[PDB]
Design a protein around this motif. Structure first.
Motif, mmCIF file in Angstrom:
data_model
loop_
_atom_site.group_PDB
_atom_site.id
_atom_site.type_symbol
_atom_site.label_atom_id
_atom_site.label_comp_id
_atom_site.label_asym_id
_atom_site.label_seq_id
_atom_site.Cartn_x
_atom_site.Cartn_y
_atom_site.Cartn_z
ATOM 1 N N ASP A 1 35.538 36.242 38.484
ATOM 2 C CA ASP A 1 35.277 37.676 38.519
ATOM 3 C C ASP A 1 36.558 38.436 38.330
ATOM 4 O OD1 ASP A 1 32.602 37.918 38.880
ATOM 5 O OD2 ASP A 1 32.733 38.432 41.030
ATOM 6 N N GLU A 2 36.612 39.193 37.241
ATOM 7 C CA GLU A 2 37.660 40.181 37.008
ATOM 8 C C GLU A 2 38.926 39.836 37.742
ATOM 9 O OE1 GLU A 2 35.552 43.478 38.527
ATOM 10 O OE2 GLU A 2 34.000 43.318 36.984
ATOM 11 N N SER B 1 29.021 41.004 37.951
ATOM 12 C CA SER B 1 29.273 40.191 39.096
ATOM 13 C C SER B 1 27.926 39.641 39.559
ATOM 14 C CB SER B 1 30.098 40.977 40.092
ATOM 15 O OG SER B 1 31.253 41.470 39.406
ATOM 16 N N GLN C 1 37.705 38.029 44.399
ATOM 17 C CA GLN C 1 36.546 38.849 44.411
ATOM 18 C C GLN C 1 37.096 40.104 43.948
ATOM 19 O OE1 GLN C 1 35.542 38.244 48.826
ATOM 20 N NE2 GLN C 1 34.317 36.753 47.648
#
Ligand SMILES: Nc1ncnc2c1ncn2[C@@H]1O[C@H](COP(=O)(O)OP(=O)(O)OP(O)(O)=S)[C@@H](O)[C@H]1O
Ligand SMILES: [Mg+2]
Lengths: 436, 71
Positions: A368-369, A38, A124
């Motif tokens: 992000d993921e 990240s 996020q």
């Protein structure tokens, strides 16, 4: 068509990470928990987007990698574009040449997209958080693509100084009467030098007719005339009677009236021009809805389409008031979202934000993921759809679900030895990396 | 053009409908580069910024005049 990337002294990336190609489409990244994945994307928008702009000391320091101090002064980042930073406003080393912030402020808009694309990224576990996200927040989401309320702030703000100004207007207004007055005084004071010169000729001719009229007869005593006799006093009686001498009354009144006219045209102008700004506003306050309620369409119209991909098992619509998602996962029975499975919700999320992201589609996007909590069924449907979306745009994802992998383009891992973190590029054994 | 943006003097209303043109005013949507509405915002702003600065100047004048008479 991203170009190269390498770092120096940024966050967990201690020294040098000259460990990157690569080309358009579906580049994927992974590695250990808090290895710096990240942090890495931080690296990214770091440069691309003005999320790292003003905020000072403990914010600005943080970024530089604070690993027992060291060269606290040196934190450089390469994309093709270099942005070094040192202790205290040591700014962009902008693209070997060297430019400014305000410079590519212009360039990204003429790219683009810019700073301006707010869905250009997407973490996020936010995606999450947006399950959480309730009716009004949805509106927001929409607005903030068409920028809308960044607009709305201005409006209100102008509209204040607007109706703030307009009390000067009244203070002004007072002063004009007060002027009008000073010319009402300068009016009588010319009426006079008029009436006056009127007389000292009017008189001064009687004076000259009778210098004749009555010497005319003494011309002739050598072998209306009464009317004029006392009339020549009814004049002299007044010049001596009423004269506050001033030789300028018609000069001083000529200019100082002109201005009053000049001004009371300006003064007037204002009102006219007010009524036109004040009119402008409503012309725009309309346009805002036009801008929104238009995007809304595009967004819904994307959404279902998108959703109906991910879950071709059922359909999803948008309703609006002030925004809702109506929904069924399999044609059976429908309704509102605030009733769904944790995961069940989480789908929409994505869809939606794709639905949104893709209405003002930018050249580039990261995630992000994005897959951190949806479980099985869908993962397949997603990675594929995304990859399908890859064609036209640059994509970058972190994952720890492997399901984007059995499908992916390029491939990267991040490694953390206790002070340094590194990205390394692998392929199939990368896909093996997780499964372990 | 340009005249607009930074936001010394110019004419108000003469521009308030130069904007309306970038919207739909005489009813021919839609042309040019339209309204980034970010743009619309910061413009409108400017207009008023000046519209105000005018009325101020004006007042400054009246007064500087009015007292110049008292002489
Ligand atoms: N500028 C910096 N200098 C030194 N250490 C940092 C800096 N920034 C972050 N860190 C450390 O690195 C961690 C952040 O790594 P991340 O990028 O968040 O890991 P990650 O990629 O988010 O992994 P997950 O999946 O989010 S746990 C923090 O917990 C800090 O300990
Ligand atoms: Mg994370």
């Amino acid at each position: 068509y991203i170009k190269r990337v390498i770092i120096k002294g940024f966050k967990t990336y201690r020294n040098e990470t000259i460990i990157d190609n690569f080309s358009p489409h579906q580049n994927v990244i992974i590695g250990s928990n808090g290895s710096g994945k990240s942090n890495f994307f931080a690296a990214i928008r770091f440069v691309l987007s003005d999320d790292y702009s003003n905020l000072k000391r403990e914010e600005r320091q943080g970024l530089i990698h604070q690993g027992s101090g060291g060269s606290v002064m040196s934190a450089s980042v390469e994309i093709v574009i270099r942005r070094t930073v040192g202790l205290k406003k040591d700014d962009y080393q902008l693209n070997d040449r060297n430019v400014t912030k305000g410079d590519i402020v212009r360039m990204l808009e003429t790219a683009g997209f810019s700073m301006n694309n707010p869905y250009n990224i997407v973490p996020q576990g936010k995606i999450v958080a947006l399950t959480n996200a309730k009716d009004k927040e949805r509106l927001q989401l929409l607005e903030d693509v068409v920028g809308a309320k960044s607009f709305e702030v201005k409006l209100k703000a102008s509209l204040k100084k607007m109706e703030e100004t307009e009390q000067k207007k009244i203070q002004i207004n007072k002063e004009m009467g007060e002027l009008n007055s000073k010319l009402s005084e300068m009016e009588q004071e010319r009426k006079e030098l008029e009436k006056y010169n009127e007389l000292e000729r009017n008189r001064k001719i009687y004076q000259f007719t009778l210098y004749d009229r009555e010497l005319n007869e003494v011309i002739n005593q050598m072998e209306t005339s009464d009317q004029l006799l006392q009339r020549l006093n009814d004049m002299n009686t007044e010049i001596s009677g009423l004269k506050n001498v001033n030789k300028r009354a018609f000069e001083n009144f000529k200019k100082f009236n002109e201005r009053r006219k000049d001004l009371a045209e300006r003064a007037s102008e204002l009102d006219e021009s007010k009524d036109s700004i004040q009119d402008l506003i409503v012309k725009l306050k309309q346009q805002k809805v036009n801008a929104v309620d238009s995007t809304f369409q595009k967004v819904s119209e994307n959404f279902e389409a998108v959703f109906e991909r991910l879950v071709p098992r059922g359909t999803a619509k948008l309703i609006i008031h002030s925004i809702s998602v109506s929904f069924n996962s399999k044609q059976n029975e429908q309704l509102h979202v605030e009733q769904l499975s944790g995961g069940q919700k989480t789908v929409c999320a994505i869809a939606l934000i794709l639905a949104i992201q893709m209405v003002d589609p930018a050249s580039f996007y990261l995630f992000d993921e994005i897959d951190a909590a949806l479980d099985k069924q869908y993962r397949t449907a997603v990675a594929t759809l995304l990859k399908e979306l890859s064609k036209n745009a640059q994509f970058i994802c972190t994952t720890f679900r492997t399901d984007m992998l059995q499908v992916a383009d390029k491939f990267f891992r991040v490694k953390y030895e206790n002070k340094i973190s590194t990205v390394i590029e692998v392929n199939r054994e990368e896909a093996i990396g997780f499964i372990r | 053009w340009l005249a607009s943006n930074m936001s010394i003097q110019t004419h108000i209303a003469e521009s308030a409908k130069e904007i309306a043109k970038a919207s739909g005013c005489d009813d021919e949507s839609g042309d040019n580069e339209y309204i980034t509405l970010r743009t619309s915002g910061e413009l409108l702003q400017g207009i008023v910024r000046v519209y105000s600065k005018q009325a101020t100047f004006l007042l400054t004048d009246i007064k500087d005049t009015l007292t110049k008479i008292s002489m």
